[PDB]
């Protein structure tokens, strides 16, 4: 239908692939007309890539350890940024005129195809330092130039936070002060860590939930008997999509 | 110099007056050309009001328990909102064409007179729910109409958070989506609770620190010997301004 535009995610191992499988499924459940793309590394097992193919339209291999990879010389300068340099390959996807990147620890709650109305770089405020955008969800335009500039920046300065958010905020440094249309509503990237009164009032309209913190949805022990985890509706939802929609897909 | 414009704060008791005394002093140290105003309630002791007069140009009494007060009928509808209705009297100060309200648990680190370049309602994002502004610091235009509309809102709906921030966000509900110039940089209202890598990179430019959480700067036990508290440079600064600049003022 809309071959020109895609949601793009990233899996660097089989654990995160379970995240991507749930994200992908949630986009399908809310009936996106866009393509679904996952960037995968060789650390993702062949059998998991086959599961990824049942949900994603494209499973695109990216290996920054390969000397043919465009980011490989940058990795040799910044060996701590392998995951970040892999994610930044989202800008190499020049077969698409516009994409929404979503981290594999997000979950979609309603159709968010109206994000394609936005322009690069559109993103929600990060809680905690709200003059930085959160890099879990963003609208961007693939470009080899932009990609190479991003690699240059990573080369010169690394990332002020060790991951992709620092570098993307440093690159797209006008976000906080320029054009409010580039501020996605917080409900398009609602932090699981995120002000209870604000949530009582605004939470029902959540469109995307972003599972932050060290413990990811797929590393909870889920108990099918009780439909519950050991340690809430979003985490329960995650597991619902996984058990109900993902598990029966490779058969 | 600039009789038309003011910084405005609020003290509902003697504890908070110590906050206001420090805020006021910090505005003076960074050489504001504007007036300094404190709204005080009768719970503030006469002797503390006299201390407040050594720092503030105007100490303006507000008593919502008085039946002559404009908010008194609203208080009878919402008896839990006395402090909030007192703060909203900042909009009654029609002798001023433009003001910056600052909670008494803020501290100024550099001249912020360039806030008078902004228009109502300008405010920084709240961390945690960043599509709401934080109500600790905001640029507004005094108006009896605006004030009465605010009282009406408080009457009809109360405050979604129990304090002033809910109601001000509900009233000024276009803040998140309209005119980025109404987004104050986070450095004009930097949460003490506020992302360590972001602070390493951005904290040096802090212009206002906002002491959040249940334990206020003035309720720490300060030890003059060690220049330290029991439980960091901002809290130490607070105490420095208090001991050095405030204590010698009533003599
Ligand atoms: Cl704008």
**In 10 A of CB B170, how many CB atoms?**
19
Give the chain A residue whose CA is nearest to the CA of B167: A198
Per the CB < 8 Å rule, is A127 touching B131?
no
Kindly report each contact of residues B216-220 with a partner whose C-beta sits within 8 Å and lies 24 or more positions away, as own/partner: B216/B15, B216/B16, B216/B19, B216/B105, B217/B19, B217/B22, B217/B105, B217/B107, B218/B15, B218/B18, B218/B19, B218/B22, B218/B242, B219/B15
Give the chain A residue whose CA is nearest to the CA of B186: A131
Give the chain A residue whose CA is nearest to the CA of B174: A180
Taking contacts as CB-CB distances below 8 angstroms, the residues of chain B near A178 are 180
| CB contact A130 to B (< 8 Å) | yes
Q: Which two tokens mark A183?
A: 């501020």
Distance (Å, whole) CA B164 – CA B9? 13
Q: Which residues of B are annotated as a binding site for UDP?
A: 10, 12-13, 16, 78, 103-105, 210, 213, 216
- Report yes or no: A104 and A11 within 8 Å, Cβ to Cβ: yes
SS3 for A86? helix
Q: Which residues of A are annotated as a binding site for UDP-alpha-D-glucose?
A: 10, 12-13, 16, 78, 87, 103-105, 134-135, 161, 164-165, 213, 216
User: From the list A128, A162, A183, which residue is nearest B194 (CB)?
Assistant: A128
Domain boundaries, given as residue ranges, for chain A: 1-251
Q: What are residue A111's phi and psi, to 5 degrees?
A: -60, 130
Question: What distances in angstroms separate CA B42 from CA A10, B93, B230, one per listed residue?
Answer: 60, 18, 31
Taking contacts as CB-CB distances below 8 angstroms, the residues of chain B near A124 are 130
- Determine the CATH number of domain B1-251: 3.90.550.10
Method: X-ray
| CB contact B198 to A (< 8 Å) | yes
| CB contact A180 to B (< 8 Å) | yes
CA A125 to chain centroid, in Å, comes to 15
- Report yes or no: A86 and A12 within 8 Å, Cβ to Cβ: yes
Rounded to whole angstroms, the maximal C-alpha distance in chain A is: 53
* Size (chain A), residues: 251
User: From the list A129, A187, A199, which residue is nearest B186 (CB)?
Assistant: A129
| CB contact A197 to B (< 8 Å) | yes
Distance (Å, whole) CA A80 – CA A70? 17
How many angstroms does the Cα of residue B122 sit away from the middle of ligand 1?
13
How many angstroms does the Cα of residue A134 sit away from the middle of ligand 1?
19
Q: Which helix (H) or strand (E) holds B1?
A: none
Distance (Å, whole) CA B118 – CA B123? 9
Taking contacts as CB-CB distances below 8 angstroms, the residues of chain B near A126 are 130, 195
Question: What distances in angstroms separate CA B45 from CA B15, B40, B56, B102, B215, one per listed residue?
Answer: 11, 10, 16, 21, 22
- Beta bridge pairs of residue A141: none
Pairing status of strand A2-11 against strand A34-40: parallel
**How many Cβ contacts (< 8 angstroms) between chains A and B?**
91
């Amino acid at each position: 239908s809309m071959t020109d535009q895609a949601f793009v995610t990233l899996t660097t191992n089989d654990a995160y692939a379970k995240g991507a499988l749930v994200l992908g499924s949630s986009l399908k459940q809310h009936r996106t007309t866009r393509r679904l793309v996952v960037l995968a590394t060789p650390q993702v097992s062949d059998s998991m890539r086959k599961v990824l193919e049942t949900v994603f339209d494209e499973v695109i291999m990216v290996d920054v350890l390969d000397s043919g990879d465009s980011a490989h010389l940058t990795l040799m300068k910044r060996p701590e940024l392998g995951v970040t340099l892999t994610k930044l390959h989202c800008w190499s996807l020049t077969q698409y005129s516009k994409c929404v990147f979503m981290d594999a620890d997000t979950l979609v709650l309603a159709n968010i195809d109206d994000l394609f109305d936005r322009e690069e770089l559109s993103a929600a405020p990060d809680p905690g330092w709200p003059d930085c955008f959160n890099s879990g969800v963003f609208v961007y335009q693939p470009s080899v130039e932009t990609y190479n500039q991003l690699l240059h920046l990573a080369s010169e300065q690394g990332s002020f936070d060790g991951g992709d958010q620092g570098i993307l905020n440093t690159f797209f440094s006008s976000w906080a002060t320029t054009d409010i249309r580039k501020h996605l509503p917080f409900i398009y990237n609602l932090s699981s860590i995120s002000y209870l009164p604000a949530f009582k009032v605004f939470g029902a309209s959540a469109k995307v939930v972003h599972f932050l913190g060290r413990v990811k949805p797929w590393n909870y022990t889920y108990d099918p008997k009780t439909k519950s985890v050991k340690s809430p509706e979003f985490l329960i939802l995650w597991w619902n999509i996984f058990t109900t929609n993902v598990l029966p897909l490779l058969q």
